[PDB]
Amino acid sequence: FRFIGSNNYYMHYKSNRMIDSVLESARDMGIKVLRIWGFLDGESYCRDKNTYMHPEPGVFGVPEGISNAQNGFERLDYTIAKAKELGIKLIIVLVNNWDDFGGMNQYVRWFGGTHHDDFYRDERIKEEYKKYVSFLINHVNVYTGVPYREEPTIMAWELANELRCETDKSGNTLVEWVKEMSSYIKSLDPNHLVAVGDEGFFSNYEGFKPYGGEAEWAYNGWSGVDWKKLLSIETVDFGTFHLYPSHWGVSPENYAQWGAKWIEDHIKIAKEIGKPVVLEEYGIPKSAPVNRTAIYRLWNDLVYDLGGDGAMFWMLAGIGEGSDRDERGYYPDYDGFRIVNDDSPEAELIREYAKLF
Numbered sequence: 001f002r003f004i005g006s007n008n009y010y011m012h013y014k015s016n017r018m019i020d021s022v023l024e025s026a027r028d029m030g031i032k033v034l035r036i037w038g039f040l041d042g043e044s045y046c047r048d049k050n051t052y053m054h055p056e057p058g059v060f061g062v063p064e065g066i067s068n069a070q071n072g073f074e075r076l077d078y079t080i081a082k083a084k085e086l087g088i089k090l091i092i093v094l095v096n097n098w099d100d101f102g103g104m105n106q107y108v109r110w111f112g113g114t115h116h117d118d119f120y121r122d123e124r125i126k127e128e129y130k131k132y133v134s135f136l137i138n139h140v141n142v143y144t145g146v147p148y149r150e151e152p153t154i155m156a157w158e159l160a161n162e163l164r165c166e167t168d169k170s171g172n173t174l175v176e177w178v179k180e181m182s183s184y185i186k187s188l189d190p191n192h193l194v195a196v197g198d199e200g201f202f203s204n205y206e207g208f209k210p211y212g213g214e215a216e217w218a219y220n221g222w223s224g225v226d227w228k229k230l231l232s233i234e235t236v237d238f239g240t241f242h243l244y245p246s247h248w249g250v251s252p253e254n255y256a257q258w259g260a261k262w263i264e265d266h267i268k269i270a271k272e273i274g275k276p277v278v279l280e281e282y283g284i285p286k287s288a289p290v291n292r293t294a295i296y297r298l299w300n301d302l303v304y305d306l307g308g309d310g311a312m313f314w315m316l317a318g319i320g321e322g323s324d325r326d327e328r329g330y331y332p333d334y335d336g337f338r339i340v341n342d343d344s345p346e347a348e349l350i351r352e353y354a355k356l357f
C-alpha cells in the first residue's frame with residue numbers, strides 16, 4: 001500500500017459541514033490517507049475551541065457541569081465514521097510536541113514540572129499520557145459501534161507530533177520513551193500500526209551530511225532525535241519524517257536539493273533497516289521565490305521512484321465558517337502551506353500524483 005496523503009488538524013473540533021468538506025475534498029483529489037490530531041489538552045485550549053478531550057488529568061471529554069460544549073471524541077467519531085464512508089484512512093497523533101492544543105507543556109504544567117522535556121521523564125506525566133491513550137484507543141465510536149482499536153479506517157497511531165528532546169542530545173531519553181509508549185500501545189491494540197510522528201532528525205551518522213552545509217542541526221542530533229535508533233524499535237512499524245527547509249535554515253535556492261537529499265537519506269536508511277517510511281508532512285511557503293509546484297513535483301517523484309511508501313503534504317483544508325473563512329469561503333491559509341481542491345497548480349499536481357502512487 002503506497003499513497004498520496006495529507007494532514008488536517010481541525011477534524012476534532014469543527015462542524016460537520018467543515019469535516020465533510022475536507023474528507024470529500026480528499027476523496028475527489030485521490031488523497032488516500034489523512035493525518036489528523038487526536039488530542040486537545042488543557043482546560044484553556046479546550047475552552048478556546050469549546051471542545052473538550054483532556055482538560056485536566058483523569059478528565060476525558062466534557063467536565064461535569066459544563067453545558068453547551070463539544071466533546072472532541074464525538075467530533076473524532078464523526079470524522080472517523082465519515083472517513084470510513086468515503087474510503088479515507090486516518091493516521092491519528094496522540095500528543096503535540098508544541099503548545100498548540102496544549103501539547104507536552106500542558107502535561108508538564110499539570111504535574112508542576114519545569115521543562116518541556118520533563119514530559120518524557122516524570123512517571124506521573126507518563127502515567128497520565130498512558131491513561132489518555134488507553135481511553136482514546138478503547139473509545140467506542142458513537143456513529144459506528146466500533147471501538148477505535150478495532151476500526152480499520154484508522155491506519156496507524158502516532159505517539160507524538162514532531163517530538164524533540166533538546167535537553168538530551170544523546171538521543172537516549174527519546175529512545176526509552178518511544179520504546180515504553182509504542183510497546184504500551186501495542187499492549188492495548190494489537191491490530192494497528194504504530195509510528196512515532198517525529199520530523200526524522202539524524203544524530204551524526206557517518207556519511208550523512210546536509211545538502212550545501214545548511215541546517216546541520218537536523219543531521220547532527222541537536223533535537224535529541226536519533227531517527228535510525230527509533231526506527232529500529234521492535235514496536236515501531238514504520239518511520240516518519242517531515243520536511244520544511246524554509247523553517248530549518250535552508251536558503252531558498254537550496255530548498256529543492258536540500259529536500260531531495262533529505263528524502264534520499266531517509267529512504268536509504270529505512271530500506272536498510274527494512275521498514276516502510278512515510279514523508280508525512282512537507283511544505284514550502286506560498287511566498288518563496290521558487291516554483292513551489294515544481295519543488296513538490298520533484299519531491300513526490302523522488303518518493304515514488306525510490307520506493308518510499310507515502311508522501312503527505314501539509315496541509316489540506318476545505319470550506320470555512322464563522323471566523324475561519326477567507327475571501328473565497330475557504331478555511332484560510334494562515335501559515336502559507338494550505339492547499340484546497342481548486343485550480344491551483346499545486347492542487348492539479350496532487351490530483352495528478354494521486355493517480356500514480
Ligand SMILES: OC[C@H]1O[C@@H](O)[C@H](O)[C@@H](O)[C@@H]1O
Pocket residue numbers: 098162244247248
Ligand atoms: O519551533 C520551530 C519548529 O516549529 C514547528 O512548529 C515546525 O513544525 C518546525 O518545522 C519548526 O522547526
